[PDB]
Design a protein around this ligand. Structure first.
Ligand SMILES: [Mg+2]
Lengths: 100, 84, 66, 208, 266
RNA sequence: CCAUAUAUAUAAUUUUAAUUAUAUAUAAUUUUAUAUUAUUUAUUAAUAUAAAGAAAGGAAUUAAGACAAAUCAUAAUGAUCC
């Protein structure tokens, strides 16, 4: 094999909840297991918002989600993505976990 | 009396005026021309001045405002705006 | 500015995070801040006496006194 | 056990540079009393050990200022600490058997090889008299000029051998070669010759 | 002692370096003869010989200029309770309140250092680097004096994630263990943040609020007391007062560190 | 990468132009010490003077729009036509 010193391919190296938990533990120290197991997310608002620009009209996806463990902790998160709605939901989940 | 301006977007002078110093060659030329005007051209009186010009222009014929920068830098400190 | 709540209640937020399970390890400052409560009153206090000269503030001489 | 950042400046913009300047300041501060009286690593070389992309040219100039201040300390009063800290950042012609100085000069497409010996001002060019080979007085004066700059005209004999280009190019190649040969006989005059403009090759050449 | 020095011959006069060493020998022995100076303020000592929190008096705080507040025209009315009065066009800070708050903050710093937490000394005014560095070194802490990068706490991955980290024992001894990339890329968050100029460091205060980092600061007459967990009413624009308070806090942190090491060595 | 200046190698100096030829390598974006004037006042620029310098030029290398093309002789494929 010709692997570089460190590979980063989890299937070829020679979902929203998991990535949210990992990034949150990396950035703020939150426990991944608590996020993945106990928190539950429901999207509240999902829409498409547009911006005019001299070249053309640019569309983006806005998501507002609410997360909570159903035992007294609740947080609201908003996410924007020009590419896809799923990424907007991912960012909203991230923010909601941050705003618990 | 003291006049206090409102909170302004900027503090800048539209046209800063700089004190360029008139070239020595030009004023020496003017003095020579006045000499030849009064005494006469190639007059004995002011011929010495000619020598100076002959040197002063020999090598070459003729031989910046930071107010806006300092104003922009200092405005937040001196404007005296209310707290928040 | 409004009197800020979040600066002085860091202990309460961290306690909620810890008990909920969102945070697993107590911060090193948690026990110290618990032992030393922050002062959470921001009140304008009345002054009745000028220290420099001793003049008493807030006194009215009634009609009977004359 | 406890995980903590290595450097005391970890929360600064460029912690590596700040820590290194802190060490340099510490040494410059302990030994401030010592009186005073070799390139340094390049910008990329310091970037590798410092902030990398975060490294800034002003930071590099500050590093160089401190390093030059520390090095400029009088060598007789320096010690092992200063030298140890500074070490991390550190990156003759003669006459022949016949008493001749041999020099080679170039100008345009002309090349000249000159043998300069001590003598009485005699000159030969391609085995021919100077006036026969060089009809133009200006070229002869150009050949003379380096000799008369050091006022040694009439004290050396010159055997010049040219090839390529035309008259002026060959003459100025002889000039530059004569200057380079003269430097050997008395190195202390080199600066003098260098200030006359005869020890610098005229890099100008025909371009497309 | 002085290697690579070539003495001069007895016949010839002294050299410049020989004269320098001769005058150094004179200075360390005889230049200080005639009197001993007492009751004189030397600025450097404020950094190197700070007093303990319990030994601080109101007179010592007033000598450092801690009481001198901002101009009455720049008053932040939320700081009313800390003010003793106004005098010569400026507000005077009540130094008894300053003493109480300073003792409380010194106890906080000592406790945090004794627990092995990370203490960050942030001060971005002109001549504050020396005291900040000395406080960080004697508290085994960290400091910033050039500029506070916004997002240093809330965006730690994009700012401070690239710099190297280190595993250490209870006695602060390097272990030289190899850290995994995930461990190296985690956020390392200060346990205590002390700010010398909170008026010019609103970003740091807001980040500490968001990240739940308890913070100390010197609250001048024009500064907001409620933006920090442990305010210290005092003058923040005079270097002497700032260095005095910082030295007190640093000595408290050093005492906490010494207690920690003493317990680990028993 | 050229050009320039050097160092090593190679040539049994009759393939001789060793003043040359072509391989490798180094060098610079010049470095400094002061003076004067400006300066965000020094750990800064303008110059000038002195010192070490052979050191003074050049080309190439990316995308995004917009226009023009049939000696678009800068082509391919397709449409139609004999
Ligand atoms: Mg202030």
């Amino acid at each position: 094999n010709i692997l570089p010193p460190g590979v980063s391919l989890p299937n070829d190296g020679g979902s929203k909840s998991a990535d949210v938990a990992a990034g949150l533990h990396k950035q703020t120290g939150v426990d991944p297991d608590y996020i993945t197991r106990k928190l539950t997310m429901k999207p509240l608002v999902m829409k498409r918002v547009s911006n005019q620009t001299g070249k053309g009209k640019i569309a983006s996806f806005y998501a507002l989600v609410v997360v909570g463990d159903k035992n007294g902790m609740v947080g609201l998160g908003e996410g924007k993505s020009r590419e896809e709605m799923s990424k907007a939901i991912f960012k909203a989940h991230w923010d909601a976990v941050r705003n618990l | 009396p003291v006049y206090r301006l409102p909170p302004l977007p900027r503090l800048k002078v539209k046209k800063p005026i700089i004190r360029q110093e008139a070239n020595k060659c030009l004023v020496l030329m003017s003095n020579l021309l006045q000499c030849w005007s009064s005494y006469g051209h190639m007059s004995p009186k002011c011929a010495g001045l000619v020598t100076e010009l002959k040197s002063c222009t020999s090598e070459s014929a003729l031989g910046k405002s930071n107010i806006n920068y300092h104003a922009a830098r200092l405005y937040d400190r001196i404007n005296g705006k209310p707290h928040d | 500015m409004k009197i800020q709540t979040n600066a002085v209640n860091v202990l309460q937020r961290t306690s909620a995070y810890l008990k909920s399970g969102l945070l697993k390890e107590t911060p090193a400052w948690y026990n110290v801040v618990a032992s030393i409560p922050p002062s959470t009153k921001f009140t304008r206090e009345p002054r009745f006496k000028n220290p420099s000269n001793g003049h008493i503030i807030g006194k009215l001489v009634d009609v009977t006194e004359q | 056990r406890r995980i903590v950042p290595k450097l005391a400046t970890f929360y600064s913009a460029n912690p590596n540079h700040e820590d290194r300047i802190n060490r340099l300041e510490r040494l410059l501060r302990k030994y401030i009393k010592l009186p005073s009286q070799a390139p340094w690593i390049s910008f990329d070389e310091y970037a590798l050990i410092g902030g990398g992309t975060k490294l800034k040219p002003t930071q590099y100039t500050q590093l160089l200022y401190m390093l030059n201040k520390l090095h400029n300390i009088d060598p007789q009063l320096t010690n092992d600490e200063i030298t140890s800290e500074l070490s991390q950042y550190y990156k003759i012609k003669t006459l022949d058997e016949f008493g001749r100085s041999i020099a080679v000069g170039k100008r345009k497409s002309s090349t000249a090889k000159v043998f300069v010996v001590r003598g009485t001002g005699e000159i030969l060019v391609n085995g021919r008299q100077l006036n026969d080979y060089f009809l133009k007085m200006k070229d002869r004066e150009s050949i003379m000029y380096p000799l008369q700059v050091i006022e040694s005209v009439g004290k050396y004999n010159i055997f010049a051998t040219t090839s390529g280009g035309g008259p002026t190019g060959q003459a100025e190649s002889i000039m530059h070669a004569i200057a380079k040969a003269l430097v050997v006989f008395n190195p202390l005059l080199k600066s003098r010759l260098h200030k006359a403009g005869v020890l610098t090759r005229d890099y100008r050449h025909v371009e497309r | 002692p002085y290697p690579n020095l070539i003495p001069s011959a007895n016949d010839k006069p002294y050299s410049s370096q020989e004269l320098f060493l001769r005058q150094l020998n004179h200075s360390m022995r005889t230049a200080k003869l005639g009197a001993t100076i007492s009751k004189v303020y030397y600025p450097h000592k404020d950094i190197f010989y700070p007093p303990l929190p319990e030994n601080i008096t109101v007179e010592s705080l007033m000598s450092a200029g801690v009481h001198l507040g901002q101009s009455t025209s720049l008053w932040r009315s939320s700081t009313q309770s800390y003010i003793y009065g106004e005098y010569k066009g400026i507000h005077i800070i009540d130094l008894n309140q300053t003493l109480s708050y300073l003792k409380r903050a010194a106890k906080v710093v000592e406790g945090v250092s004794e627990s092995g937490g990370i203490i960050l000394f942030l001060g971005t005014r002109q001549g504050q680097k020396r005291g900040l560095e000395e406080a960080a070194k004697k508290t085994h802490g960290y400091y910033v004096s050039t500029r506070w990068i916004p997002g240093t706490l809330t965006n730690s991955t994009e700012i401070s994630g690239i710099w190297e980290k280190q595993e250490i024992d209870s006695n602060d001894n390097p272990t030289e263990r190899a850290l995994s990339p995930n461990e190296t890329s985690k956020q390392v968050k200060p346990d205590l943040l002390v700010v010398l100029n909170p008026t010019e460091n609103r970003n740091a205060l807001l980040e500490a609020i968001k990240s739940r980092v308890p913070t100390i600061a010197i609250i001048d007459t024009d500064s907001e007391p409620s933006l920090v967990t442990y305010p210290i009413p005092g003058n923040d624009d005079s270097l002497r007062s700032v260095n005095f308070l910082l030295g007190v806090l640093a000595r408290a942190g050093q005492r906490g560190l010494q207690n920690r090491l003493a317990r680990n060595n028993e």
